[PDB]
């Protein structure tokens, strides 16, 4: 699938991403977390659950710098303290 959210399109077959039809590369680890998040929409995944579905803090933070319009106040990939990281689509 090509999961689209906001300005971005994530191609799961070729493991590619596009910001407004411009190709942004993804690390093997960055994709494993991003695909894990967007494959469980509206479900918060704990830190242990994320690692199994693929340090992680760096990948979340480095993904927030690419995806979020305000990485200091994320909307797509936001953290619920006590549960885990959640991805909410449009």
- 88: which residues sit within 8 A by CB, 6+ positions away? 41, 42, 75, 76, 78
Q: Output the CA–CA distances (angstroms, integers) from residue 79 to 18, 22, 49, 74, in the order listed.
A: 24, 27, 14, 8
What is the full DSSP assignment across 64-82?
HHHH-SSTTS-SSEEEETT
Extents of the domains making up the chain: 2-87
This entry's atomic model was obtained through X-ray
CATH of 2-87, one of 1.10.10.10, 2.40.110.10, 3.40.50.2000, 3.40.710.10: 1.10.10.10
């Amino acid at each position: 699938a090509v999961i689209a959210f906001g300005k971005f399109k994530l191609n799961l077959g070729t493991r590619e991403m596009f910001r407004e039809d411009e190709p942004m590369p993804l690390t093997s680890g960055e994709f494993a977390v991003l695909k894990a998040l967007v494959s469980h929409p509206r479900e918060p995944l704990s830190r242990d659950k994320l690692m199994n579905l693929a340090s992680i803090d760096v990948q979340i933070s480095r993904l927030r710098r690419m995806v979020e319009e305000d990485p200091a106040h994320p909307r797509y990939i936001q953290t619920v303290w006590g549960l885990g990281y959640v991805f909410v689509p449009d």
